[PDB]
From Swiss-Prot, chain A:
NCBIfam families in the cross-refs: L31, PRK00019.1, PRK00528.1
InterPro entries named in the record: Ribosomal_bL28/bL31-like_sf, Ribosomal_bL31, Ribosomal_bL31_A, Ribosomal_bL31_sf
GO BP term (any one): translation
PANTHER family found in the cross-reference section: 50S RIBOSOMAL PROTEIN L31, CHLOROPLASTIC, LARGE RIBOSOMAL SUBUNIT PROTEIN BL31C
Entry note: cofactor: Binds 1 zinc ion per subunit.
GO CC entries: ribonucleoprotein complex; ribosome
A molecular function GO annotation: structural constituent of ribosome
Record's keyword annotation contains Ion transport: no
Keywords: Metal-binding, Ribonucleoprotein, Ribosomal protein, RNA-binding, rRNA-binding, Zinc
Keyword field contains Cytoplasm: no
Quaternary structure note: Part of the 50S ribosomal subunit.
Phylogenetic classification of the source organism: Bacteria, Thermotogati, Deinococcota, Deinococci, Thermales
Protein name as catalogued: Large ribosomal subunit protein bL31
Family label: Belongs to the bacterial ribosomal protein bL31 family. Type A subfamily.
From Swiss-Prot, chain B:
Organism of this sequence: Thermus thermophilus
Keyword annotations: Ribonucleoprotein, Ribosomal protein
Keyword Ribosomal protein: yes
Name of the encoding gene: rpmC
UniProt-recorded Gene Ontology molecular function terms: structural constituent of ribosome
Family: Belongs to the universal ribosomal protein uL29 family.
GO terms (BP aspect): translation
GO cellular component terms, semicolon-separated: cytosolic large ribosomal subunit
NCBIfam families: L29 (TIGR00012)
Xref: InterPro entries: Ribosomal_protein_uL29, Ribosomal_uL29, Ribosomal_uL29_CS, Ribosomal_uL29_sf
PANTHER family: 60S RIBOSOMAL PROTEIN L35/50S RIBOSOMAL PROTEIN L29, LARGE RIBOSOMAL SUBUNIT PROTEIN UL29C
UniProt-recorded name of the protein: Large ribosomal subunit protein uL29
Highest taxon of source: Bacteria
Transmembrane parts of this sequence: none
Swiss-Prot record, chain C:
Record InterPro entries: KOW, Rib_uL2_dom2, Ribosomal_uL24, Ribosomal_uL24_CS, Ribosomal_uL24_KOW, Translation_prot_SH3-like_sf
Disulfide bonds: none
Subunit and interaction comment: Part of the 50S ribosomal subunit.
One Pfam family recorded for the sequence: KOW
PROSITE patterns: RIBOSOMAL_L24
Protein name (record): Large ribosomal subunit protein uL24
Entry's Gene Ontology BP terms: translation
Record's keyword terms, sorted: Ribonucleoprotein, Ribosomal protein, RNA-binding, rRNA-binding
Molecular function terms, GO-annotated: rRNA binding; structural constituent of ribosome
Keyword Ribosomal protein: yes
Source organism phylogeny: Bacteria, Thermotogati, Deinococcota, Deinococci, Thermales
Recorded GO CC terms: ribonucleoprotein complex; ribosome
From Swiss-Prot, chain D:
Source species of the chain: Thermus thermophilus
GO BP field: translation
Taxonomic classification: Bacteria, Thermotogati, Deinococcota, Deinococci, Thermales
Gene label: rplW
Main function: One of the early assembly proteins it binds 23S rRNA. One of the proteins that surrounds the polypeptide exit tunnel on the outside of the ribosome. Forms the main docking site for trigger factor binding to the ribosome.
Keywords in alphabetical order: Ribonucleoprotein, Ribosomal protein, RNA-binding, rRNA-binding
Name this protein carries in UniProt: Large ribosomal subunit protein uL23
Pfam families: Ribosomal_L23
Length: 71, 67, 110, 94
RNA sequence: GAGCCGGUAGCGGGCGUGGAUCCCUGGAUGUCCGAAUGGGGGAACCCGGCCGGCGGGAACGCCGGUCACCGCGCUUUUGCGCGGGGGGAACCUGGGGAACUGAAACAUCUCAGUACCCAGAGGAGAGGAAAGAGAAAUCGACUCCCUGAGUAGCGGCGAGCGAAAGGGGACCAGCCUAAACCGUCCGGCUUGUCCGGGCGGGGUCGUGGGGCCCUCGGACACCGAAUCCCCAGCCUAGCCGAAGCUGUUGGGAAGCAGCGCCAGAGAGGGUGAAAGCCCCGUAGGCGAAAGGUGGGGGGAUAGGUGAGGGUACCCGAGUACCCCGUGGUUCGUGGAGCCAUGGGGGAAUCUGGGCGGACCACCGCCUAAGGCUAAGUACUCCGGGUGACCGAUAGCGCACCAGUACCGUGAGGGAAAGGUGAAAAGAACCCCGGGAGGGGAGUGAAAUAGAGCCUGAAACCGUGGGCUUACAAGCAGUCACGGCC
RNA sequence: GAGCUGGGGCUAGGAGUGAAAAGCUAACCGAGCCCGGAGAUAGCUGGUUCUCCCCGAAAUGACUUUAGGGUCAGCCUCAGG
RNA sequence: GCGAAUGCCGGCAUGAGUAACGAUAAAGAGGGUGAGAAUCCCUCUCGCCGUAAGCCCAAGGGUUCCUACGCAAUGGUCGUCAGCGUAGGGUUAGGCGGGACCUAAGGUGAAGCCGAAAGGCGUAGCCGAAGGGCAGCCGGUUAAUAUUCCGGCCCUUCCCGC
RNA sequence: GCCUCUAAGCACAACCUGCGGGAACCCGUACCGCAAACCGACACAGGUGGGCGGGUGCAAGAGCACUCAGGCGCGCGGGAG
């Protein structure tokens, strides 16, 4: 591993697709899109005591950095 | 030579040292023999080896006891 | 006939055989009971070597096979072998006792 | 482990002549350092190690009934004397 | 218990009843490779730095003890002392994850979360005390079996796919931690009264915990190894242990015959052709050890559990929850719920909050966003045993110098050959011959049992004999008859 | 001479290259070779084994991405009435 | 329980004693050794190479090379011949080569950047070349190896000292 | 390698230079080796890297024709034709 989160796990899976709708509107589901993909967050940082970083990931980030900001 | 087992029991540092060393040399003698007396030799070879082997078994036992 | 045995040098009888005339069992193995009763061999009409007289034909052929020999013979011939009752401090004495008896006491004879 | 001995003389013919006037040839623990030769040599036969050279040989062509092989490893090394001393009996011998 | 120097028996030499061969349990170096790690490297081989040693001293060079890397916690000093890693036939958890074929096309669908790449804990993990079930004012951990219907149902509602509570069964410990409040304390910042981290009481099992007031309270409970001692089950060595001989046809007998025999042990094999009484330490029963493993049964070791009301409350998770983007699930898009997460929003302390019915009004339910493990189904490397399971072209391909020969660059493929005889007595010796090999002698019960040598047939080629055949056209044959023998 | 050549290397097999025809890619890669799904699938061909006894088919109908296939109709056989 | 499936495995047949012997670079004699020699040994006539059918280093092969016995298998028959079978012996170098040194491409990789995982990328230092660099040659001796052995002649660095 | 300074020692015992003394290990050669021993499953006339390539003659020359050394006579034979 080398890109999950830092403040927990948000690094993985995704199966999905579509095709089309038109249901409780006029009929059944134009059904189909057998597709697969990724799905994730972002990066950023601050300072320990003169010289630092963070890295981490998104939200978990914001709350967190706040947290150790507390110290 | 369970008796030899005994002598064994008996000696210690430099003792067993040169004992097994010299004895070893003895078997060398044998090595040399590899084409002379031969016939009654046989045993000097097999046994002698077993003997010196013991020599080592002991050194191990003793100095092992030590460290 | 296994890692364990019957009589040893011993001296015993030949039931199903051709001789029956028991006698000195010169040697008996551990596994193949292979025992030589010194009671029926041949010559192996030897090599033609000077190994045997330069004019050879070995004589003492004696490898005894079959195991229908009636081992042990006290004042009694065909008898199985008992075991012990020890009797003395540290006493195996798996001597042979049945009807007559024989244990091959280390004395007068095997 | 440390049983100095490490050899078997070169009962070899051709090798004879050397034994004959100043050098001597033998089979040695396939491994001994050449300086190893010098030492085993020196303390073993109380001599004067001079010129210590080495060669090696494995076996080729031994048919064994239903399968085959050709042998192991025989090591050769030759060392010469300084005066022509030691090895006496051995040499008068073969 | 008295013989052994493994399969080689042969040569040439041996050790041993003052427990030798050997069966077992713990011993010692234990070459070099291989995770390799002192360094490098086409592994199994070449380099090097520290103390010891010896040698011709120094240079050389060996035994030696020596010196990755990782993360990990501690003395964050100068860091010394721990951990992993490397495997493993199948079972196993999660990680990621596919066409065929079906749907007689085939794009939803299908095989399927199946094959396979991976990471990893084990000896088995998995799951494992309920924001459960389910609606009766009912149940009560988790797992696996039978049943639950192949119904309830999911769907180009098509091929198809397909539950769950209950009930029967088996197996039945439950246990915990931050959860500011307590006080303690050290560090704090900066000083008063915030945070930080150690000790705790609190350390929620089916709901309280803390702090104030009063009733309180003065011996039975063991863990998931808390832990130790044992009969330690075994490991491999142990031991006994039932009763016949005479004859007799036979090369043989254990067989036909005679009489005499055993039996809580007529399971079987083995002793020259088919034995309870002959070989077998077996069925008979019993045996046994100072090591390496524990459930039991019991002890002790017992951390830690084990009260009543009152009172303003503060005290299990950083996201529940709701928008869309998705996984599960018997759900394939739908009125579609609950758990589960990728995006954005974005909180409640027991009037709390998800859960039964999309949703709203009810009752009811459970108590979430931490932690631990036993026990019952799986698996088969390895051991034991049994087989209207196999006989050498079936069986593992593989019954014994087959995963080796040999093909392929590597990946990788992947044979064949089981038996002479009862025992070696398996062939002295004579004779043709370079040899093989061939006639004799001996073997012996046989050698048409003779070394690839049991039983040893078909095919094909051969030596001799019978009939038959040179004016003959026909698969074959074959009905007839005549000539031979 | 965009010459030829030994040694040492990197790119590779739904990718490589490629003075590019669809070339060569361990001796026949128009999409490699070994093992695996798997014994894919096979209305098509082959092949489909002792004796004897009874009967005796059709080789047409109907719709079919079927049309050398198939569901139901027509003919057959064994059993009851 | 089976002809039968250009079946599966193993035999055994068939053209066939014809096609074929691997190069049109030819060979003939004498004596020899032999159980037997077109097909081995000497020696004598003779043709073809010679710019190769030369020698030489290297590669790669890894036995074998030799000396001595032997030929039932093997050579595409021979065969008392062998690179065949059996046994024994055979190559040794401070100065030749390669490491005990250098490095490119180039692989590794302490750092570092980076993946659902396995990895991707990688400075530095290292590994990594008949590309770098380095100290000898010639004459003689074995069945057999050589500037490695012997000998003559010419050096090489590193250590102890002075 | 020649220098060219820190480190820092050196400098009194570091380097440059003579003579004496003493050292120097690891793995390598046999032979085949433009080819019956290396690669094509064969004693397969195919391929496979560098060293003058002896001599005569030819204008020149690794081509030519005969040869030097050195290498052969291909390995199944005789026979009429």
């Amino acid at each position: 591993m080398k890109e999950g989160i830092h403040p927990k796990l948000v690094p993985a899976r995704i199966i999905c697709g579509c095709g089309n709708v038109i249901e409780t509107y006029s009929t059944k589901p134009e059904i189909y899109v057998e597709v697969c993909s990724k799905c994730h967050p972002f990066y950023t940082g601050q300072q320990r005591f003169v010289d630092t970083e963070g890295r981490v990931e998104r939200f978990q980030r914001r709350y967190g950095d706040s947290y150790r900001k507390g110290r | 030579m369970r008796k030899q087992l005994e002598e064994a029991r008996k000696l210690s540092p430099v003792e067993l040292e040169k004992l097994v060393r010299e004895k070893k040399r003895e078997l060398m003698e044998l090595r040399f023999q590899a084409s002379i007396g031969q016939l009654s030799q046989n045993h000097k070879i097999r046994d002698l080896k077993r003997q010196i082997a013991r020599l080592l078994t002991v050194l191990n036992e003793k100095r092992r006891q030590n460290a | 006939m296994r890692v364990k045995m019957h009589v040893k040098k011993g001296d015993t009888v030949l039931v199903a055989s051709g001789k029956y005339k028991g006698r000195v069992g010169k040697v008996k193995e551990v596994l193949p009971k292979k025992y030589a009763v010194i009671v029926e061999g041949v010559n192996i009409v030897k090599k033609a070597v000077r190994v045997s007289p330069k004019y050879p034909q070995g004589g003492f052929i004696e490898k005894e096979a079959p195991l229908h020999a009636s081992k042990v013979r006290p004042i009694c011939p065909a008898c199985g072998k008992p075991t012990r009752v020890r009797k003395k401090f540290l006493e195996n004495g798996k001597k042979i006792r049945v009807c007559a008896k024989c244990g091959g006491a280390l004395d007068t004879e095997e | 482990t440390a049983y100095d001995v490490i050899l078997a003389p070169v009962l070899s013919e051709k090798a004879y002549a050397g034994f004959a006037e100043g050098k001597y040839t033998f089979w040695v623990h396939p491994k001994a350092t050449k300086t190893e030769i010098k030492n085993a040599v020196e303390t073993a036969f109380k001599v004067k190690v001079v010129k210590v050279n080495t060669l090696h040989v494995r076996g080729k062509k031994k048919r064994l009934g239903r399968y085959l092989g050709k042998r192991p490893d025989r090591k050769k090394a030759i060392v010469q004397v300084a005066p022509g001393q030691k090895i006496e009996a051995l040499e008068g011998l073969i």
